[PDB]
Design a protein around this ligand. Structure first.
Ligand SMILES: OC1([C@H]2CCCN2c2ncnc3[nH]ccc23)Cc2ccccc2C1
Length: 167
C-alpha cells in the first residue's frame, strides 16, 4: 500500500492520472520522481523546467555540478540525483527528443531505467515538448516498465485521449 490517490489502474504495475507532476510530488513526497531530462541536465522547460522551478533552482545547481564532473548523459540514459523538496530522489531520464532528430527507438532504453526503482512518479517520456506521440510513449511504458509506475499527465484533454485509446 502507498499514498498515491485517484489513479486509474492500467495494468498490473502501471497507473495513470491527470495531474501536475509538481503538485503531485509535493503532496506524496515519493521515493523517486522522474524528470524528463536532456543530456546536459539543462532544466529549461516542460517537466524539467517546472520541477526545477519548484526547487528554487537547487535542482539546476546540483545538475551543473554533476555535468561538470561527469559530462553529459546518453540519450536513453539516466542519473539519480537529489529530489530536493519534492521527493527523496530524482531520476533524471533522457528520452529522445524528436524535435532534435533523435531516434524514437531509444524510448524503450529510456524507460528501462525505471526498472531499477520499485516505485516511481513519472511523466510520459519523450512526450510534450520532446515531440513524440504520447499514445506511443504510454504503450512503450506499459511494455517496458515492470516496477510500479504512477504516471502524471498534465493535460486533461490528453489524459482522456490516452485513457480512451488504451489497449
Ligand atoms: O504530461 C505531459 C508532460 C509533457 C509536457 C509537460 N508535461 C507535464 N507532465 C506532468 N506534470 C507536469 N508539470 C509541469 C509540466 C508537466 C505530456 C504531454 C505531452 C504532450 C503535450 C502535453 C503534455 C503534458
Amino acid at each position: 500500500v502507498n499514498s498515491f490517490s485517484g489513479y486509474l489502474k492500467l495494468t498490473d504495475n502501471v497507473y495513470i492520472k491527470n495531474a501536475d507532476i509538481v503538485e503531485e510530488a509535493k503532496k506524496v513526497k515519493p521515493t523517486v520522481v522522474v524528470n524528463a531530462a536532456n543530456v546536459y541536465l539543462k532544466h529549461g522547460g516542460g517537466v524539467a523546467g517546472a520541477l526545477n522551478k519548484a526547487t528554487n533552482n537547487a535542482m539546476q545547481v546540483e545538475s551543473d555540478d554533476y555535468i561538470a564532473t561527469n559530462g553529459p548523459l546518453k540519450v536513453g540514459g539516466s542519473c539519480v540525483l537529489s529530489g530536493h523538496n519534492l521527493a527523496k530522489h530524482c531520476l533524471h531520464v533522457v528520452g529522445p527528443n524528436v524535435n532534435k532528430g533523435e531516434d524514437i527507438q531509444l524510448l524503450k532504453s529510456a524507460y528501462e531505467n525505471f526498472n531499477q526503482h520499485e516505485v516511481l512518479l513519472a511523466p510520459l517520456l519523450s512526450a510534450g515538448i520532446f515531440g513524440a506521440d504520447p499514445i506511443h510513449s504510454l504503450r512503450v511504458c506499459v511494455d517496458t516498465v515492470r516496477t510500479n509506475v504512477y504516471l502524471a499527465v498534465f493535460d486533461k484533454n490528453l489524459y482522456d485521449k490516452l485513457v480512451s485509446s488504451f489497449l
